[PDB]
Amino acid sequence: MSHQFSPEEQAVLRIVQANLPDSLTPYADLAEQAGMTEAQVLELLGRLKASGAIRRFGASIKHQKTGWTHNAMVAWKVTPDQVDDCGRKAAEHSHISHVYYRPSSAPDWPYEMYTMIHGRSEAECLGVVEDVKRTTSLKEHAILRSLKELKKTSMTYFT
Amino acid sequence: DMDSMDRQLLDIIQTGFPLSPRPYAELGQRLGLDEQEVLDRVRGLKARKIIRRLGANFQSAKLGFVSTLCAAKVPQDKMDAFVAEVNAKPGVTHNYLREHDYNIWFTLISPSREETQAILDGITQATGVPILNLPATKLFKIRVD
């Protein structure tokens, strides 16, 4: 972090990565806690918002069903000429949020295209898997059913 | 669960809580509310937990961090020690037991591809278990709510 941000700026970012101070005047509170002027606090956040480094400065809210219920990570074989078309045609499905291509040259892990599938039931999530086979050239796959969630944590970027 | 003023407020402050000296006043000006009522409302929505957090959300890549997905074939006899070494890492934010020969799958974020590999190499040296480092080179479309 010290190559991109002064110590005072990192002090700001450490506070805001959790919560804004709870007053009418949070940016003046940030300035007194960190080394700096309220105007410098606002320039710093303003700069990172503008650049995209801060994706959102604001309220994260509950509900809005973050995927009705029930997730499904499935990995598919795919040749280089198929990647972009399959990735695109796969991503078009309403129940598929995103598709990654993660190359692999492990002989016993030949799957490279990952479709993150959303559902209600088992056989819905697997129904989406049949949907992918009829609407893309993807065929061979491995369902990596989650058995146990071992860690679930948010990243701390400013320490 | 709340009034139309609260939905207007949230619509504003999920796009962006204002960067100005008196943010509640700016919001009050825009919503037709006095400054203190907008703070009162924010504080109530946080305490009813409809607002989970009010603060910054960062784009990792733009802060110079890289992310990957890791996978291993973990024998029953190494499971406990493996899982503990993996969960010990602050840059591991997801770790899952999954139904496949490759039965341990985790994400790992760090400042660089080299730091990430050194982390993975240390895990393997501690547990004797090799790990596949599987970074994404293409993403096809991503959404949240």
Numbering used by the authors:
A (entry chain B): 1 to 159
B (entry chain A): 22 to 166
Paper text:
Here, sirohaem undergoes decarboxylation of the southern acetic acid side-chains, attached to C12 (ring C) and C18 (ring D) of the macrocycle, to give didecarboxysirohaem in a reaction catalysed by sirohaem decarboxylase, which is composed of two subunits called AhbA and AhbB. The AhbA/B complex is a heterodimer formed from two similar protein subunits that share a near identical fold. Both proteins consist of an N-terminal and a C-terminal domain joined by a linking region. The structure of the D. desulfuricans AhbA/B complex reveals that the enzyme shares the architecture of the AsnC/Lrp family of transcription factors.
To investigate this idea attempts were made at producing crystals with bound substrate, where native crystals were grown in an anaerobic chamber and soaked with sirohaem. The soaked crystals diffracted to 1.9 Å and contained additional density consistent with the presence of a tetrapyrrole. The electron density of the bound tetrapyrrole suggests the decarboxylations at C12 and C18 had occurred and the bound molecule is actually the product didecarboxysirohaem. The observation also indicates that the crystals are functional as a decarboxylase. Overall, little movement is observed upon substrate/product binding as there is only a r.m.s.d. of 0.3 Å between native and product bound complexes for the 296 equivalent Cα atoms. His115 (AhbA) coordinates the iron in the macrocycle (2.8 Å) and Arg119 (AhbA) is positioned such that it could interact with the propionate group from ring D of sirohaem (2.8 Å). Lys152 (AhbB) is in a position to interact with the acetate group from ring A although the electron density for this side-chain is poor suggesting it is in disordered state in this product complex. These side-chains help to position didecarboxysirohaem with the methyl group of ring C (C12) within range of Arg102 (AhbB). We suggest this is the catalytic residue responsible for decarboxylation of this side-chain. Mutation of Arg102B to an alanine residue formed an inactive AhbA/B complex.
